Design a protein around this ligand. Structure first.
Ligand SMILES: Nc1ncnc2c1ncn2[C@@H]1O[C@@H]2COP(=O)(O)O[C@H]2[C@H]1O
Ligand SMILES: Nc1ncnc2c1ncn2[C@@H]1O[C@@H]2COP(=O)(O)O[C@H]2[C@H]1O
Ligand SMILES: Nc1ncnc2c1ncn2[C@@H]1O[C@@H]2COP(=O)(O)O[C@H]2[C@H]1O
Lengths: 201, 204
């Protein structure tokens, strides 16, 4: 679509290998990013450096937007590539000029910002209101809706490790392993390696 | 410093709104209703809440004069309100349809910049809340909440530190604790000489 094509014509596009850190928490923010290809994880940490996954973002998602609207702001989280990525970049200064030329590009960015607030608010609800079983169950549903999930005769197939699930839902790997065994016994999933089939999705 | 600078973008925006007055405790936005209208707080304070299936409430945010509300449906048609918003004081609230506001954006996108600057701050705040809920126990969440509240513009200076006006029930709704649990932990923090429980958070 022509708004995005115009936007991307004002960016530079960089390639990043999987596992590369795109954005470091607490660095001064001067640049907006947009995922042309690939996916990333948005991470925060506790004081002893345990990570939690706030969000996955995918092709077509803006990143690094939270610093755009106020001078002096710092990055609010880490962003790490989970695949090879191609990521467009543009300075906030130049983007602010583009918005005045054609605010449709701000509409596209703001649409994502609103969705992210809705989704992160739902995550707050899950953490406040659900037990570990309820959280893992909801997480397996959510992962089954990510663009990289694969169709399967019995539902959707995902590849994710127990550690990674635990970092999404706020559980130990051990707790994840125990609940996944229970869900398998209840015939709600199957698990083979880092492969999980989420039935009925 | 003193003496308000005129704000032409805001005055233009407000000239296209209708203002309505809402008493304390009134519901401004009802979760699950179709979203077709944007609001802006001219005066007053609100709480943004979500509820579980048993009606336990969690407060996501307090919002105040100069805050937009009901913005999250603006960018795609057919969405529902994502949370409840309730008046904490008497409010004066400007309202405008999403259809008109979208026209204003094309006239002067600075009004969308102001709205989006608030969405960005809210995302930072709500993301920190996700980390607190995942990483901290009840005492940790309560300590962090008191620390946060004492840094709000509406905290009052006190000979012993900063003073906040908030009930044990309200803290419970922020942190995900019963009010009795909050009361016990506040007594712990008081015995540790960190606070006095309005609540005074010590500092010099
Ligand atoms: N809750 C969230 N959901 C989705 N993305 C997020 C969230 N929190 C932070 N981010 C992204 O991570 C980025 C870190 O840098 P910024 O704060 O500039 O912009 C941030 C957002 O793009
Ligand atoms: N996490 C949050 N922080 C601050 N405000 C919120 C949050 N979630 C929802 N809201 C506000 O509550 C409103 C509910 O109606 P909308 O979803 O239209 O728009 C929403 C925002 O104005
Ligand atoms: N996990 C939770 N446990 C207990 N109360 C909670 C939780 N999450 C939210 N709350 C709300 O926090 C409130 C604190 O005051 P109450 O004890 O009157 O009622 C409580 C609920 O409405």
């Amino acid at each position: 679509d022509p708004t995005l094509e115009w936007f991307l014509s004002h960016c530079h596009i960089h390639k990043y290998p999987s596992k590369s850190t795109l954005i470091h928490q607490g660095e001064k923010a001067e640049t907006l990013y947009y995922i042309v290809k690939g996916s990333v994880a948005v991470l925060i940490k506790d004081e002893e450096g345990k990570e939690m996954i706030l969000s996955y973002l995918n092709q077509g998602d803006f990143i690094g937007e939270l610093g755009l609207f106020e001078e002096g702001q710092e990055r609010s989280a880490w962003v790490r590539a989970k695949t090879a990525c191609e990521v467009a970049e543009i300075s906030y200064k130049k983007f602010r000029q583009l918005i005045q030329v054609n605010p449709d590009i701000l509409m596209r960015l703001s649409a994502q910002m609103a969705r992210r607030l809705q989704v992160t608010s739902e995550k707050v609800g899950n953490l406040a209101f659900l037990d570990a079983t309820g959280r893992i169950a909801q997480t397996l549903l959510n992962l089954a809706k990510q663009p990289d999930a694969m169709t399967h005769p019995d539902g959707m197939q995902i590849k994710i490790t127990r550690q990674e699930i635990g970092q999404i839902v706020g559980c130990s790997r051990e707790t994840v392993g125990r609940i996944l065994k229970m869900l398998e016994d209840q015939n709600l999933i199957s698990a083979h390696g880092k492969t999980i089939v989420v039935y009925g999705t």
